Design a protein around this ligand. Structure first.
Ligand SMILES: O=C(O)/C=C/c1ccc(O)c(O)c1
Ligand SMILES: O=C(O)/C=C/c1ccc(O)c(O)c1
Ligand SMILES: [Cl-]
Ligand SMILES: [Cl-]
Ligand SMILES: [Cl-]
Ligand SMILES: [Cl-]
Ligand SMILES: [Cl-]
Ligand SMILES: [Cl-]
Ligand SMILES: [Cl-]
Ligand SMILES: [Cl-]
Ligand SMILES: [Cl-]
Ligand SMILES: [Cl-]
Ligand SMILES: [Cl-]
Ligand SMILES: [Cl-]
Ligand SMILES: [Cl-]
Ligand SMILES: [Cl-]
Ligand SMILES: [Cl-]
Ligand SMILES: [Cl-]
Lengths: 251, 250
């Protein structure tokens, strides 16, 4: 604001769980603010998200970025996380943001599963959210769950087990049952304001077809396919992802 | 079980919320179990729900009935409840029931908004749930939120407030935003096993069309329109709804 600028650690509560986040506070009495959502098994302080936050703050756009339940410093077991309760975390964070008296426009920015959170939350709040940036939004998680193959880990999609050993973690059965019937595009499509879609052509984790589909369903969207980029927009690709995001939002 | 019969309080956690419930425990080493779900602003111990649980227990069908988040004895503010986090409560109850070694078949019984929770939970667990009874299930909560009128409380459906005073309570705006796009019939239709639909013809809170619609969508449903019954199946209609429910579950 006019008096304080910089970082602070913030904590919110959703259904008895603490959510830990980082706020970047820019100059000025009034400013826009982005809520930035990390992906599946990630956290709020990946290099991509730290750099999005930094780049937006460089343009006087505030941001908050939280660890979802079951991730980073936030409460709850990973086994108990679903995309639905991450949407609930997102709405709790939105509650905090929309009552801040300095905030003018609210933007959502999401990477991967965090992009599914953002897109569905924007379709639930199409009157309140002003712009959305989706980075490699993992809408394919639904089809993957219907097919019985999530990130190479297989199971009967009609007899989902109670819990699924999942690389080094344990993925909840309820995560997969929710994922199969999540109305991702049905809800997301109700957001008719501007959307920026950014997806690496060499993403082997979420097919770039997810972004080509969101681009079809959205009334006012712009698709940026990034030649050769990977799922995480890492290294030599990170700046372009951060640049497109910031430009879209600074307009 | 073979040694204890009767009522007990049970508590479960869902996220960081405690849910408080009542278990009705019948005779016998193995038995079927109904999970019973109350409606909007109700609690686990309404007359109707108590009578259903007792009637099942007399037929050696166990049951549990919990207060949803933001209701009765359970944790959380009412303002923060939605049908979505009720399905999350119902799933935490299902986790408890499905790991009990005495339980044979699992049934869901839901009244009004508890009926939408039951029908959606059964469409998420169509492999596990064996039968579902819905009493006046409130699927019309969706159309009502799209219309901008929830039990006579009004708002612009395209400009839903942050919160809405509602009788002596505070309803959350997110409840309403959820309601408008809730895929009630899409998810519910995945359950292809037997469903009993019980709806009173003089229900003024939830149109009987709600249960006629479920009857169309379900592969295997039986529809009971009880002539003269109101939303709560009050007075003489209560035993009629209870006996249909018990008979169907067996
Ligand atoms: O957030 C990510 O980085 C990846 C998410 C993702 C991608 C594919 C799936 O099947 C799934 O459950 C989650
Ligand atoms: O549970 C009940 O007894 C009634 C539920 C109900 C009925 C109509 C609505 O619009 C609504 O949000 C909830
Ligand atoms: Cl100021
Ligand atoms: Cl990193
Ligand atoms: Cl988050
Ligand atoms: Cl897929
Ligand atoms: Cl990749
Ligand atoms: Cl749209
Ligand atoms: Cl488009
Ligand atoms: Cl007793
Ligand atoms: Cl026993
Ligand atoms: Cl009562
Ligand atoms: Cl709410
Ligand atoms: Cl709200
Ligand atoms: Cl809210
Ligand atoms: Cl469907
Ligand atoms: Cl009535
Ligand atoms: Cl039918």
């Amino acid at each position: 604001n006019l008096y304080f600028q910089g970082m602070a650690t913030i904590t919110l509560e959703r259904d008895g769980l603490q959510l830990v986040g980082t706020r970047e506070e820019p100059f000025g009495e009034i400013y826009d603010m982005a809520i930035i959502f990390h992906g599946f098994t990630a956290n709020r302080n990946t290099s991509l998200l730290r750099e999005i936050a930094n780049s937006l703050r460089d343009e006087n756009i505030a941001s908050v970025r939280f660890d979802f339940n079951g991730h980073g410093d936030s409460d709850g077991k990973f086994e108990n996380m679903t995309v639905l309760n991450e949407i609930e975390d997102a709405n709790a964070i939105l509650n905090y943001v929309k009552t801040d008296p300095h905030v003018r426009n609210i933007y959502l920015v999401g990477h991967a599963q965090g992009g599914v959170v953002a897109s569905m939350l924007a379709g639930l709040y199409p009157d309140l959210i002003k712009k959305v940036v989706l980075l490699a939004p993992a809408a394919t998680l639904k089809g993957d769950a219907l097919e019985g193959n999530t990130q190479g880990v297989t199971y009967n999609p009609d007899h989902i087990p109670d819990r699924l050993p999942f690389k080094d973690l344990t993925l909840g059965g309820f995560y997969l049952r929710i994922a199969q019937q999540l109305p991702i595009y049905e809800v997301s499509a109700q957001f008719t304001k501007p959307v920026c879609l950014i997806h690496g052509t060499d993403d082997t984790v979420v097919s770039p077809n997810a972004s080509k589909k969101y681009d079809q369903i959205y009334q006012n969207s712009t698709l940026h396919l990034i030649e050769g980029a990977d799922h995480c927009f890492s290294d030599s690709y990170q700046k372009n992802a951060v640049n497109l995001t910031t430009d879209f939002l600074q307009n």
